[PDB]
Design a protein around this ligand. Sequence first.
Ligand SMILES: Nc1ncnc2c1ncn2[C@@H]1O[C@H](COP(=O)(O)OP(=O)(O)O)[C@@H](O)[C@H]1O
Lengths: 238, 481
Amino acid sequence: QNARAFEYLMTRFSTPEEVFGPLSERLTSGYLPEAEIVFLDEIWKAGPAILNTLLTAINERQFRNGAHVEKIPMRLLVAASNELPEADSSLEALYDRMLIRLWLDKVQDKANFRSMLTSQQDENDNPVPDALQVTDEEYERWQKEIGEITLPDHVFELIFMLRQQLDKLPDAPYVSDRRWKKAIRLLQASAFFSGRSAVAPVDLILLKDCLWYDAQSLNLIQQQIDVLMTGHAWQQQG
Amino acid sequence: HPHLLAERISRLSSSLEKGLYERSHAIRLCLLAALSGESVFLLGPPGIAKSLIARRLKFAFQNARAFEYLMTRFSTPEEVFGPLSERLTSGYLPEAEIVFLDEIWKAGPAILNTLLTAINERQFRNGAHVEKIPMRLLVAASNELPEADSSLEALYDRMLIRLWLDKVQDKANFRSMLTSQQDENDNPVPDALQVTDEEYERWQKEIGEITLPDHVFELIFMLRQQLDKLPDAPYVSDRRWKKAIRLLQASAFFSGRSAVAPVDLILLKDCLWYDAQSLNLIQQQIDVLMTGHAWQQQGMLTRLGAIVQRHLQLQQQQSDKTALTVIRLGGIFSRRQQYQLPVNVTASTLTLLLQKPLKLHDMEVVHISFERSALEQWLSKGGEIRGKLNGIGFAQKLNLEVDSAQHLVVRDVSLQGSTLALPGSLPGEIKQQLEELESDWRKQHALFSEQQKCLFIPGDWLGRIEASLQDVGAQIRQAQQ
Ligand SMILES: Nc1ncnc2c1ncn2[C@@H]1O[C@H](COP(=O)(O)OP(=O)(O)O)[C@@H](O)[C@H]1O
């Protein structure tokens, strides 16, 4: 009911004044410090000062607005690109902090391409009804009830086992401790909006887009989880 | 008054630990360096809680500011110390207290040049006049190591504490860590445990007033000469030895002490090494020093040997009263058997006395000491005996055989006879000198049983110190039996 958009393209010669609003103390009228859902395309080529300001707006939800600081009501942070960053660069600090790594691709099915090729639905209207939109009061209350989800003993036996399996495989990517803590908030939120009070074992499917980092480790993460979900989840291989 | 200071620090570090498991060695080391004006370095993979410790120690004070910046390959000094108009340093580093600099091994050339003047002088140039920086804690984290021939080594050699963090390994400490409800942006430190600005300026002057005992200097100078003789040991500059004293004097200040304690030398395990190769060498030399010359472990070993030498000297003169005799079992059996003293020696290493001394291994000997759990091997399997001499050295090969009268005749290079015997089952001269050395062990043990409550000491080091003190005490109680 109170969301704003911000579609910006990061270039090799971009300046922080053209992103967070130019100063006069900074004219942040509809940009990022007061926005909710911002879009950043081609993030792997911005300036050095642009990436440094984005790290403080994630762990603290604040911004250095000259003298006094202020909070940022950022609810969703999305970023898209095409290529991959270097192996020894400063751009890996933001990639290791992002949770979900969606892997989109072009369409392949023929039945779903007929209506998609000739679609009359507008992409700038409001297809969401006014009765299905949440208010600002319900958002602040839901941020606290997610952490109250209990962790069953059977769920912990699969998280610790998957961590030890990737450590023994040399070709498996390294997963930091921050990724394991942030992934629980995603699984607990999935069972919260599904009519459950505890962490469901089926929620481990979403971990296929939170462990890999390149195209080489994409076929390894989706393979170990497929065996885990069809082996030790509901005691398949057991 | 000094005794109540150690209790206030123990309650301050307890609230800082809430939220970060298996990180007690990293928070306690940053708290002591912040109250003494020292730096700290962290190394490890990105994602092992390296930036939160810089934002957590600021809540333990009353006027602290945070500064989390990431140094890049194209970073400029104007974006770190504030742009100029004379420089707008509103909330950056010249007026901050605890700053955080991640990936410091890739900044610009002018960035590192300004960080060197803000450490030795605590100042920063600003066009014309200069000003002081109220910096209290300097932390820097990264991932890899710099080059061997580069300009980045000027800052690494100046940092004192080199923390070695790593990912979690324990399973019990990972359950509550995986699902933690503690916020990382609140104020878990109470208002009563936060020091003021007046108490900080007063503590910085009382650290230098800590006296240096004469026994403590014997351990620092010995460690410096030991690392110089080892080619694989890392080089330690003279600046590191001077800056390490401020860390040890600050540990005893917040622990209820007025002098430098020998137990404070444990913190030197993270202030000498520089890479992963020298990490296992520094922790090995200190472990031997703390269990050898700290509380006079080996110092009493060279003194107890002189008492045993004087005691065995008066016992070998009257060894003609009772000698050694091995049985000659036969009846219905082949070769006879050979053994040693029974319950008369209740130890794994028994001693033997000889009458006529000989020259074995181009040296004189007054008593032959064998192993109780190893002498039966040669006496049953046969071959060549392996025993030490004078209670020292390795198991040398001697020329021992069986005599017609069952006597351990130790032969040499001249085919000379030497019948071994046993000491008698305590003179007044030996007992008087033994009580003087035994009383010294109780004085050294009483010091460890009073200062072990230091919060800035890891728990795994107390197991090796207690095992080293009981080993010396178990040997001094053998001669008095
Ligand atoms: N070993 C750990 N134990 C507990 N919490 C951790 C650990 N590692 C990371 N975290 C949590 O992850 C969050 C972000 O950590 P971060 O600053 O990214 O670490 P780093 O600076 O090492 O990358 C912190 O709030 C911290 O609570």
